[PDB]
Design a protein around this ligand. Structure first.
Ligand SMILES: *[C@@H]1O[C@H](CO)[C@@H](O[C@@H]2O[C@H](CO)[C@@H](O)[C@H](O)[C@H]2NC(C)=O)[C@H](O)[C@H]1NC(C)=O
Ligand SMILES: *[C@@H]1O[C@H](CO)[C@@H](O[C@@H]2O[C@H](CO)[C@@H](O)[C@H](O)[C@H]2NC(C)=O)[C@H](O)[C@H]1NC(C)=O
Ligand SMILES: *[C@@H]1O[C@H](CO)[C@@H](O[C@@H]2O[C@H](CO)[C@@H](O)[C@H](O)[C@H]2NC(C)=O)[C@H](O)[C@H]1NC(C)=O
Ligand code: CUO
Ligand code: CUO
Ligand code: CUO
Ligand code: CUO
Lengths: 825, 825
């Protein structure tokens, strides 16, 4: 016949709601009955009554430092709640959540006086302080506020309450949770109470402060949130697998029927095992179960994200000592300088029941060690100083010295709910609004003459500038080496960033040329369009790049073979070539294949022309260059996941360890528009693309899930194959290498290799030889591979080297290819 | 399948949420595309594209002053919403709700600059203002804040928004809702915008200010509330039964599926009929659906409560307009003195499509009309002076002079959700805690030496202090007359009011003596109890009230027949006495029956003693007095309920109007502790007990519902009955009048009557004769009712009047009874 009481946010309360709350607490404070505040406050600690109120010695009263701590305080809150429902509150016990960052202590808690808006009569605010009746009629609770409460997020840093609550919500075991949970809860006792004798910081006098119940309203809310989490994870939220022995022992003093606890329902559900079902048993709800505005789903995702990182903790073993105290620990390396670690607090009183935690209470020091430039396994110690409520050093003998525990990263897939503008999608799938946004954006970026502008970022690739501005005689980008992929990843990110700066809600799209295409995609090919908002006709920003120091626009002379490269269907050399690339389980072995095939598209779309995609020095000026590299980057993305699928390394590579360590030249300089690319300049850092903040929808090749990709790759390794190996290097210009096999003197159609380069080039030499399989070619000509080993049967390889210059053709410089027979294993 | 966007409260936003929002809007503002801010803001008004973007003359653009106003703007918001979701906002469009009273303008709107907490980078706040690009490039929106924004509830009065928001939600037809709903929405346009030309108050430029959208996120929410309300009532929420003509016509410019709207879902759902299902079609939710913290259930309860009241409205027929305007009306009586009436605003521009409401926009004037002490149908006029946006006074001819409408009170039962401590309960149903609460409070109250204290409030009835001290020579309480019930209603209230003042969470219990009782209920009967909290034994506060000026404690000498009077239990004289009381459909007829039965109990528990319940002058000092009057008051409450059921007057009476008008003497005096009893000292005010704020656990007699009571009452009238009529009046002392019918000098057991009085009394004469039916006594006596008409047959009536003091006894100073034959009909 009656609906649940709702515990609203304190600052959510209306004038009508506040009014009833204040008047209700006012009456239940003047109420000398057991239903009154002095009496309810007495349940917690100081006038002790819990062994039994008649006992000679009383170690009473409340449960602290044990798994049953949350239940006692839940039921204790419903005790206080039922009282002011009956004393006329229209709402349940409000909470202020420390889940959000703090600016001020709540008004209804701090304001000395209260004016009833409806009667206009100013009165003392019942929530400002509590009276401790038995000591003196004139003994008020008092408070002292720590700056710790009002902490705000820094650049990388997050507030103490945010971090430790999440570390608590992180737990999947109740007892593990409860330990972290309780000590987080100790904070506001510690931060509002302070050094003051009759306060939240003293176990005895705490419940006499009205704040206690607004506080623990939120403590209980956190537990429900954690309960909600356990339901979400398919775990037992309403039961406890650990500490089962304590779930039977009924909650005192509530367990006392007859004269001491008059509330019927509270007595009935005195077993902590019955306190689990709060909504059915005690009939109260929360308006919102949110941790800092996060949904239970948003919460769990965050948690799982945090679990993926490599984390190291400090562990403390906590035993009660009969007083409240504040703990400070520092991280100290072998070198003298010590840095400030963190803090935690204990709640305590002289009549506290002795307690000992059966677990380690963990605190996270990972961000601190990372700033200390020292890893988890390297020589650092923790010193801890703990002051009493009194307050003087405890000293140091009290708590066993802290332990340190690192948790290894756990490799598992995540949601990860990337923003809508940071996802790179197939250029064919783009909607019209995606098109207009991009085209409007790129024009502004090109017209941008600042350092963020298109001219400058185009210059990072092909201008004559690296290694340093004054010295070269050199070209800046990275080819052809293991860190080639890495360089163009930042470069692409740098482009994405500059785009958003001019209103791009669309990440740079990728054109998939591995699929059959009769023509260039419209976004890249189309010359002009009619804007409707002006009567003006605008030229497509994606089809023409201006090179300001050469006074020329880029040119695209598209070789007929590009469209003809991939018409299998699915039987395309380009498909087969890429599949051979995916096969590689080594990053370096994968990289050469990746870059050579990447050279192909450069050559064929801009060929036989200077100031084109074919020309390494100027290719970055053509806006397709970026659309192109969004594709090769995605091809890498597929491979990283392919590797992750095979358990082989994805985030790291055992290659170019001298390279991977060092940051990349054009980006790290002080002369860089955005701080973000400067930050991630190092190859090791940008190995994984998710941490960089973008993603591809989606990662799959020709309608094959990654399970299917590896499946056919295993199928290709099962057949005997023959390769031609090419050791490639810088020839200071672009070229096409044609390969053709001769059975005797007759030679037809073996294959083609493209090499990128420029007049201004960075001299490069490949660590190994690029492969291209002639397996299917030999089957076509009935030249059996085993006959390759035969001296009588004569086969030869001929290369036709023709530079971009046209033809020219070029004398034979590059090392001649090698035959590789790869038996199936 | 992407998760719904949530429209959060502004103040609820986390730092991360504010961050993603600010950067997103920052981007989409620099977005020159159609997806950008400048283009979307155009959709509303000034660069006018709406008839079609290419027309010579363009009536553009947004729908205003018509039924489909909410659908256009709902769709308009999802337009703006999807932009910044795609521009990277993690949350939906925040709302700023005026449902709560205002103190300030919300933060992300009012701060000129914003510093990213995470990067430490200070930037200009994108929500502070908007750019109007087609005017000068350095042209921004500005604001001007009216005092009206920050209105707070003072005494009985409530803020403009609260009053008028609810008036809108009150509506049951969509069109009637919409008309009120929209003028409400116009307030913040007028209040945030002000005199400024480029502001929210000018139709043209409003949407260029981002504040518009936070505003209209709440506007939509309010409609969703109203939708949710209509769902509660079993009415159509997702359809509109009125203005079906308009619901078909697609919303422009959204309707344009061309370069003008590149949003797919927006074009598809450009039908305003399609705009209703927001969650399915547009995929956005609200964090909470609450009007000033009130739930939808709480809302309708308030709304229904307001429908029971008698209300009068001023009506305005709104056609417009050249511009935005501010309207002001005053209420003026026959005499010249004017009071401030409310105000309202309209939104407009030079390019607005002509509009006319087909109904009256209602404003409420009931509260203020009362302050002018004049009724609705009487001699008063409304003059309105309306000033424009420029603003020259607009000619009275511009808007038709206002009309005035009175909406009659709708009599139907309500919820009404009364506080727990203000419920008066059957004394036997009380739990152990209510008992302890009652006692502790009464102890404090009797101890209380203040004017709020028991000595002073009990002195109100039994003194000797009626107007004017020290003239009396008089005695104050009101017996015996129609206003007897009224006087003792306030008295009981005054008693409750003072009890709460000492921590009583329990309203005064009623003890039902119509039910058979072996002894007095322990709350009244038990002498002492042992408090467990203090080792002391305390005596029950409910017996032996102390009388200060007589230095004597009251005594209860209980006559043996009181418990024996009700041995029926339905056959009990008391049930039959009360059932006869309920039968009266006139108030005064009801009053005499009630007050005589009232005297019966007063007399029998404290009989034959001075300083007792039987003594009129000192009955008030015995605590059980108040428990008794809780019972008779409940009897009156049931009677009132019956009158309502019988469709006869309940809240009013056609009896003595001389007495009903004047305030009552002990309470109205400036020498009264609490202002609440002073105000309601008038008998007219006290008629409905709910308006006073308390209630009874249930209104039912002997297991009969109020329907069953009237059913049995009709049953009794269906038989022939014989009464004896006693005209009673003030003799200066209490006495008991025994009725005895004698056939022929043989007399036995006819009935009994009691009358209350004291040395210090208020002289009283009853308006009628008390009736008591002897019909059952006669049928036992085998005396035919028709033999009463026989002169030949011998029967007569004798009264042996004995004083309260045994015997003493008194001579016959009261008129002898009259025989009344009531033929059944
Ligand atoms: C201040 O507080 C500390 C913490 O309680 C006191 O330390 C305890 O004092 C009791 C005697 O009252 C001893 O029996 C305990 O062994 C002490 N425990 C510890 C850990 O010190 C301390 O005595 C107090 N001193 C002052 C100056 O107030
Ligand atoms: C485009 O259409 C006409 C011009 O072709 C513009 O309106 C007028 O056209 C008539 C002839 O049909 C002329 O006599 C008027 O002098 C024109 N008026 C103006 C103001 O140009 C029309 O304005 C044009 N559409 C717009 C508004 O851009
Ligand atoms: C301010 O606005 C009002 C109307 O918004 C102006 O009055 C309008 O004047 C035009 C003539 O140019 C009339 O056609 C309109 O009917 C008028 N509006 C109404 C309803 O009165 C007024 O002139 C403006 N004030 C100034 C001087 O700027
Ligand atoms: O309540 Cu027992 O301490 Cu937080
Ligand atoms: O590699 Cu330098 O960019 Cu295609
Ligand atoms: O809606 Cu167009 O005006 Cu606020
Ligand atoms: O009537 Cu004034 O006392 Cu019961």
């Amino acid at each position: 016949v009656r609906g649940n009481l709702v515990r609203k946010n304190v600052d959510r309360l209306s004038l009508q709601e506040i009014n009833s709350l204040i008047h209700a607490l006012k009456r239940m404070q003047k109420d000398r009955s057991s239903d009154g505040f002095e009496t309810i406050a007495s349940f917690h600690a100081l006038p002790p009554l819990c062994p039994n109120p008649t006992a000679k010695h009383r170690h009473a009263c409340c449960l602290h430092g044990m798994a049953t701590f949350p239940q006692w305080h839940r039921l204790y809150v419903v005790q206080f709640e039922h009282s002011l429902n009956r004393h006329g509150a229209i709402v349940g016990v409000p909470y202020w959540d420390w889940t959000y960052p703090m600016t001020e202590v709540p008004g209804l808690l701090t304001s000395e006086k209260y004016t009833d808006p409806f009667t206009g009569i100013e009165t003392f605010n019942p929530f400002n302080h509590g009276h401790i009746s038995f000591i003196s009629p004139e003994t008020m609770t008092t408070r002292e506020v720590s700056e710790h409460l009002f902490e705000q997020p820094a650049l990388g840093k997050q507030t103490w309450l945010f971090n430790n609550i999440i570390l608590a919500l992180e737990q999947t075991d109740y007892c593990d949770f409860e330990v972290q949970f309780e000590i987080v809860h100790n904070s506001i006792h510690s931060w509002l109470g302070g050094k003051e004798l009759y306060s939240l910081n003293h176990l005895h006098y705490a419940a006499y402060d009205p704040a206690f119940f607004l506080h623990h309203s939120n403590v209980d809310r956190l537990w429900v949130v954690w309960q909600e989490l356990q339901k979400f994870r398919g775990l037992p939220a309403y039961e406890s697998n650990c500490a089962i022995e304590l779930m039977s022992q009924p909650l005192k003093p509530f367990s006392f029927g007859a004269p001491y606890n008059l509330n019927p329902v509270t007595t009935k559900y005195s077993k902590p095992s019955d306190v689990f079902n709060y909504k059915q048993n005690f009939h109260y709800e929360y308006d919102m179960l949110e941790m800092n505005g996060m949904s239970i789903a948003q919460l769990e995702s965050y948690i799982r994200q945090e679990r993926q990182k490599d984390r190291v903790f400090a562990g403390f073993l906590l035993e009660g000592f009969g007083s409240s105290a504040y703990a400070t620990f520092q991280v100290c390396p072998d070198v003298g300088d010590c840095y400030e670690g963190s803090h935690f607090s204990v709640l305590g009183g002289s009549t506290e029941m002795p307690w000992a935690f059966d677990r380690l209470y963990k605190m996270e020091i990972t961000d601190i060690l990372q700033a200390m430039a020292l890893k988890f396994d390297s020589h650092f110690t923790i010193k801890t100083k703990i002051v009493a409520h009194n307050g003087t050093e405890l000293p140091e003998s009290l708590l066993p010295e802290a332990t340190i525990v690192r948790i290894p990263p756990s490799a598992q897939n995540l949601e990860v709910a990337i923003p809508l503008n940071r996802i790179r999608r197939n250029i064919n799938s783009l909607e019209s609004r995606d098109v207009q946004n991009l085209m409007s954006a790129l024009k502004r970026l090109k017209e941008d003459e600042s350092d963020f502008g298109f001219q400058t970022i185009a210059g990072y690739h092909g201008s004559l500038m690296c290694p340093t501005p004054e010295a070269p005689e050199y070209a800046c980008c990275l080819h052809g080496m293991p860190t080639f992929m890495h360089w163009h990843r930042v470069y692409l990110l740098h482009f994405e960033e500059s785009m958003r700066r001019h209103g791009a809600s669309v990440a740079v799209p990728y054109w998939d040329w591995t699929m059959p295409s009769d023509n260039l995609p419209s976004l890249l090919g189309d010359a002009d369009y009619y804007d409707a908002w002006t009567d003006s006709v605008i030229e497509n920003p994606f089809l023409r790049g201006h090179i300001k120091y050469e006074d020329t626009y880029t040119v695209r002379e598209i070789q007929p073979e590009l469209f003809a490269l991939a018409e299998g269907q699915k039987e395309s050399t380009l498909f087969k070539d890429v599949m051979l690339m995916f096969e590689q389980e080594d990053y370096c072995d994968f990289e050469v294949q990746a870059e050579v095939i990447h050279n192909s598209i450069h050559y064929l779309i801009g060929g036989h022309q200077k100031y084109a995609m074919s020309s390494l020095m100027f290719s970055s000026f053509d806006p397709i260059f970026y659309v192109h590299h969004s594709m090769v980057d995605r091809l890498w993305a597929i491979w990283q996941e392919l590797q992750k699928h095979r358990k082989l390394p994805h985030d790291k590579a055992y290659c170019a360890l001298d390279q991977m360590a060092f940051p990349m030249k054009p980006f790290i300089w002080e002369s860089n528009p955005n701080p973000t690319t400067r930050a991630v300049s190092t190859p090791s850092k940008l190995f994984d693309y998710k941490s960089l903040g973008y993603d591809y929808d989606h990662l799959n090749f020709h309608g094959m899930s990654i399970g299917q990709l590896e499946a056919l790759i295993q199928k290709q390794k099962k057949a005997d194959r023959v390769f031609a190996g090419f050791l490639l290097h810088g020839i200071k210009i672009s070229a096409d290498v044609h390969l053709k096999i001769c059975i005797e003197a007759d030679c037809q159609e073996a294959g083609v290799i493209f090499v990128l380069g420029g007049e201004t080039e960075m001299p490069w030499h490949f660590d190994r030889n690029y492969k291209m399989d002639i397996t299917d070619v030999l089957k076509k000509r009935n030249i059996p591979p085993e006959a390759l080993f035969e001296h009588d049967s004569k086969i030869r390889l001929e290369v036709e080297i023709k530079s971009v210059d046209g033809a020219v053709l070029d004398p034979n410089s590059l090392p001649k290819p090698s035959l590789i027979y790869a038996p199936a294993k």
